[PDB]
Amino acid sequence: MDPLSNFEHKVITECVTIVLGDAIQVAKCYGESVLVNAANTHLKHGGGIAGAINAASKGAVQKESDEYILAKGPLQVGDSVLLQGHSLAKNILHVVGPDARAKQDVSLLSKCYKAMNAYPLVVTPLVSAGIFGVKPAVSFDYLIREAKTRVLVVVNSQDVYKSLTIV
Numbered sequence: 342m343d344p345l346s347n348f349e350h351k352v353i354t355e356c357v358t359i360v361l362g363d364a365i366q367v368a369k370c371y372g373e374s375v376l377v378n379a380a381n382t383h384l385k386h387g388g389g390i391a392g393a394i395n396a397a398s399k400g401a402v403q404k405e406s407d408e409y410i411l412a413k414g415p416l417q418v419g420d421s422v423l424l425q426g427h428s429l430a431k432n433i434l435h436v437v438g439p440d441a442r443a444k445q446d447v448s449l450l451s452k453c454y455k456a457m458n459a460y461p462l463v464v465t466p467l468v469s470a471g472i473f474g475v476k477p478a479v480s481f482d483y484l485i486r487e488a489k490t491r492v493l494v495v496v497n498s499q500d501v502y503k504s505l506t507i508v
């Protein structure tokens with residue numbers, strides 16, 4: 342009855358556990374979880390996890406996101422918005438990490454990860470660690486520092502996983 346017994350994982354803190362795998366697969370195991378999307382300011386879900394989440398939703402995520410942006414305008418870097426879960430999770434928290442390519446302030450990861458504490462169980466990638474160019478260890482450091490809730494941080498690369506878990 343513990344989904345983590347079926348996954349390669351390491352307990353990091355009493356709050357945070359890191360899992361090697363696919364964040365969408367992990368979130369599907371926890372019906373009351375919130376799944377984080379590593380988004381951009383306009384919720385245009387291209388290429389990384391965001392595109393996978395949109396594909397998993399058969400486009401419904403993008404349609405919702407389109408509507409949201411036209412109603413409310415774009416997010417600022419470091420902001421987040423809770424949107425529907427689309428049967429992937431209870432809800433999807435779209436979080437806008439800093440894009441190092443744009444020279445944005447990496448410390449805005451503090452705000453990103455703080456936004457997760459509103460929810461009792463969160464499944465998240467390492468925000469800003471892919472297309473956005475922030476080192477996985479930097480992103481993980483922020484998460485570890487900020488977490489005050491149950492967080493499953495999920496990494497799809499064994500190489501990233503081992504870089505973060507072997508001490």
Ligand SMILES: Nc1ncnc2c1ncn2[C@@H]1O[C@H](COP(=O)(O)OP(=O)(O)OC[C@H]2O[C@@H](O)[C@H](O)[C@@H]2O)[C@@H](O)[C@H]1O
Nearest residue numbers: 363364379381387388389390391466469470471472473497
């Ligand atoms: N399904 C997944 N499960 C877990 N980890 C994942 C998954 N897919 C990607 N990753 C990893 O999650 C981290 C976050 O990577 P990105 O998705 O590229 O996120 P980010 O760097 O915040 O870039 C966001 C930007 O990319 C676009 O998808 C998004 O529209 C935005 O423009 C990276 O280490 C990436 O390899």
